[PDB]
Amino acid sequence: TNTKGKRRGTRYMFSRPFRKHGVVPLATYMRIYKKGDIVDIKGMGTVQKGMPHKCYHGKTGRVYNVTQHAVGIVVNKQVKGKILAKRINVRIEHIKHSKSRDSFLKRVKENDQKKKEAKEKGTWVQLKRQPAPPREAHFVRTNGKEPELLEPIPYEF
Amino acid sequence: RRPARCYRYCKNKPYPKSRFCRGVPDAKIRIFDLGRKKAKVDEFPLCGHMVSDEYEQLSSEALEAARICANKYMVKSCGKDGFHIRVRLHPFHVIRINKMLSADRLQTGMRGAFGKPQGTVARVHIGQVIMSIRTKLQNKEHVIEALRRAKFKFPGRQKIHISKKWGFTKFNADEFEDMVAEKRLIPDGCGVKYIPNRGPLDKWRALH
Amino acid sequence: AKSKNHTTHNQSRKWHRNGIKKPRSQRYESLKGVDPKFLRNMRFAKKHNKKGLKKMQANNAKAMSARA
Amino acid sequence: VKVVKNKAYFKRYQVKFRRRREGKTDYYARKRLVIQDKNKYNTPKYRMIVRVTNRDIICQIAYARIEGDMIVCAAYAHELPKYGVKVGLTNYAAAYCTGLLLARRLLNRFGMDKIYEGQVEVTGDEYNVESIDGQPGAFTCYLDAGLARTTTGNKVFGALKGAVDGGLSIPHSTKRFPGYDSESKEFNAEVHRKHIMGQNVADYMRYLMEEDEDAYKKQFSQYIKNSVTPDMMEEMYKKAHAAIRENPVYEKKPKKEVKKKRWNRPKMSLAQKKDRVAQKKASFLRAQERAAES
Amino acid sequence: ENPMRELRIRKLCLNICVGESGDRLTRAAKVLEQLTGQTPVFSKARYTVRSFGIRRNEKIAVHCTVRGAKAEEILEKGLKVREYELRKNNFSDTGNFGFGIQEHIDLGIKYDPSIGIYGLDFYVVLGRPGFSIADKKRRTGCIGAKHRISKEEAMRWFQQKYDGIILPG
RNA sequence: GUCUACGGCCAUACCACCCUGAACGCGCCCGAUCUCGUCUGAUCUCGGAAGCUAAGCAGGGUCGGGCCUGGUUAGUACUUGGAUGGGAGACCGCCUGGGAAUACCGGGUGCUGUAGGCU
RNA sequence: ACGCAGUUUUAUCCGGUAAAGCGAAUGAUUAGAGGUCUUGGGGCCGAAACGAUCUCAACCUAUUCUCAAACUUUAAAUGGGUAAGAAGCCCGGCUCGCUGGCGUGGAGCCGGGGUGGAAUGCGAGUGCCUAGUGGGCCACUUUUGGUAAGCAGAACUGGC
RNA sequence: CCGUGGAGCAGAAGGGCAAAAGCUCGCUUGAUCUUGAUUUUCAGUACGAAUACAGACCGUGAAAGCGGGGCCUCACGAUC
């Protein structure tokens, strides 16, 4: 009864946001998609051929197929009782890289360089990521001035 | 005319007189200012206003009765054009009536139950001003008595405040005369135009 | 004769009994659906790998063993 | 009283695009010239950019990257007096000449001069470059006519014919070369050959020298103030094509400083701007005091 | 003492709005052909009316644009007919004007009884060198402020050349 | 310190008005016999170069409008979770954590890549 | 140590609701002030005259009060996806009819080299057969119709 | 002369579009033949619609490309 066709909940989602109507900029096209990249999917209302669905907006998947001017993605979609890895064919205009994997590759390269320098000079560099520790026992300063006194203010309207 | 006890607390979403209603009758109130409409700014220094305490609806007929009562007490109290009253709150919500006996069982039950448009109410948030009366400095008791006599005629509980601001504008009455005397605030009818100094220089050259 | 038409209550508590796990994803993923021109490339690539990859790769294995 | 001016117009206004407000591209053809299909992943699509300007034509080969366009090789019309084309910088002969220079310069940079000679005797035929097996493949490139309209006789096609006889594998159909009969759909090679060798200006010089010497001294003054006569033009470009095909190497200039900086006013600072405002205050106040009294 | 900024007749527009299509419209095109020495170009209506009887895509009017020597010649004939006397509100604020004539054989062409007598609308635009920026394809910009033509510049040019009379009433 | 050709980001780079531009360069400009296309060489196409930076263009300015960014707005409006908390209800106060926007005020107003050229 | 997670963190994307906004588009809407183009209408100088003048409306300019489930520049909290390593790095070479300036790109194959890569908790993976079930209800909070209900209808979580 | 969609895009609305997806003009039949994969509804069955390809034979354009119906979301139907 919700008129189950394609693209029905999308008065806002496939819209080009604001002061960005018009032609697509070409840096979206001129990018390199190899098998094994990790891509975000974001709807573009200007190119109406290969929009994915309203389901896969914002989902982040793996690339496995490359054609002339589109790309095939595998995306984990949740349905009723289980999640499934589906296979979508999306044009290039809806796609961008996730910066998360590139940040992780920078982590891996820093870890390899620290590992080589550590095996070189015998240092134990602790190249894991430690979460935010509690504050160490620091030592505050109150020179010159007594601390400012605060009190709750009287009500007015 | 159904009793206003039921058309009360803001339950349903706001439903304005618009493209989709198309059959709502006219609201009860039509004019909103009663006193000296063409009053200039320094002709009335103070203003007393009426703050709502509850979150509720007010009906257009109730606003109609209240502005008439306040108007009558003002023109009996401090003379004609000794006040400028403004109902700051306008009705735009449209309430619905699903009326029956349209006396037997045999018309319909609750089957087609999207009601016809009854009339117009005004939605109120807590701390929103209903009425504002700007008067002379001598008329302080008359404003309090007038808004007291309107307080009984609105539903619910709401209080009466005497503003710190000059006029209907948003500027302080203490800073007001000290700051209009030289530089910034040019009077504009009943309103007051603020000037920044980040304009073209033609404004400052047209001044002074 | 009226009944409750549609609901989604008591559904998440059914779904998380056995657990909403992922779809396994083993190594060497299924290769159907990929570009037929690329697939026609890769099949002859594989069989000529297995054809000609004996002699020169054996030479290079001997060379890299002699180096190290 | 006339209109409602414009106030939220600015707050909602999109600029078109940086190149589009200057008006130099369209992007509706650039989005099909630039973009390489993703099956090849790295191999760039080379654009031959030929731009006609008053006093100068520009032949460049570029390709596209995400940081910007990367120009591989470029050749300009004013280089031709070093090759022996003294005047005639924007004629169809200069178009063919610059295309031939650009093709020879690219092939000299890549070292594929001795193979892929292309065409030497200028005929204006449908000479498409065949690749030679057992050798490195031919350079393939695609035109950009730009905003200029492709009409039979547009000298972007002359630059095309120059590059093609130089030996670039550029796909082209013959029906936009000049000399092509538009009613009867045959193509004439001899007329286009005459138009390449430049006997149009030869006939027009003979026409002016018969009809009116006033116009012949009005235009063509730079021609007669070094030298131009039609037989010398028809043998001059014949010399010039061989002079290019023997030495396209382009000797870069020494650039150098040897100069005095100082041409353009810089941005005046915040305090200086605010003190301009303060002087504009004080002078008007002084006027308000003085001239109202006197 | 001003560099190459000369008011010159950019183009001259000639119009005949016949109320109908067919015979009288064709004879009006024949009139404009005999004036200009070039074939005219027709006009029509996006919407009709039925009150004065035009329909959609009816060949209502003819017109022509004349540039250069013939333009200044036919402008000379027009000011010759109207005795160089043009009122102030004949000039538009943006610098162009139009004045019009009736009785098309005032200009000096033989009358034929076959064709007839038509009312012919003359419209003059003024041009300075540099106005051809806004029309061309590749690079197009705003014209600017000091370069454009004013009411005052147009009326002073018409005072200078042809010795026109301005008629402020 | 600049421009041209091709660009990337797509208003910090628009719009209005006023100043200044030496050298190259872009233009404006002078003409239709060939190629071309129009009612019209105005637009498009083509052979140039007597003039001109007047305009575009390039730099600067406007207590400029807009944009971007940062304060104030404001720990306010809201809000995950909780209470045998208050309240007739309407709603409101508290613990726990997170946390916004306009008027108001201050600052800026293109940055770059490739190839080429002038001081 | 394998693997996993109704969880958190560390990154990274996504949304257009609460809220707010109208001196930002659209839609409604209150009142004052300024201005002189446009008329029609009143008055006055008058045979009459855009001859001159006063007024009216409309118009425009900056302002002002209030709004929106089928409006929106902005924009939360809660939330959804992905990543947090040996299936990964790095080196060297072979094959390709695909691509092509190029021994170029991309895939595949082979050989070699170094596992200590957020917190916390746990044993996981997988196949067959199939019963009963397909009449629900209530509670916090968010919500649609209704005056309202121990009413009808939804969402998240728990209970019966 | 101003004119950032205030118009038009067959239609109900929403989205999108300005040297364009709008208007005019010139050519035209890609509204053709054929295997598959995938999305959408979903039990992860179908019809319908759609996406990305592959191989022919073409249209167009100078060319890059575009095109296998309508700028997108509806316009349709098993066994026998």
Ligand SMILES: [Mg+2]
């Ligand atoms: Mg009763």
Ligand SMILES: [Mg+2]
């Ligand atoms: Mg049931």
Ligand SMILES: [Mg+2]
């Ligand atoms: Mg084009």
Ligand SMILES: [Mg+2]
């Ligand atoms: Mg001609």
Ligand SMILES: [Mg+2]
């Ligand atoms: Mg012709």
Ligand SMILES: [Mg+2]
């Ligand atoms: Mg000309």
Ligand SMILES: [Mg+2]
């Ligand atoms: Mg200039």
Ligand SMILES: [Mg+2]
């Ligand atoms: Mg100047």
Ligand SMILES: [Mg+2]
């Ligand atoms: Mg500013």
Ligand SMILES: [Mg+2]
């Ligand atoms: Mg500037």
Ligand SMILES: [Mg+2]
């Ligand atoms: Mg919504």
Ligand SMILES: [Mg+2]
């Ligand atoms: Mg709200």
Ligand SMILES: [Mg+2]
């Ligand atoms: Mg059983």
Ligand SMILES: [Mg+2]
């Ligand atoms: Mg069962």
Ligand SMILES: [Mg+2]
């Ligand atoms: Mg049953």
Ligand SMILES: [Mg+2]
């Ligand atoms: Mg609560």
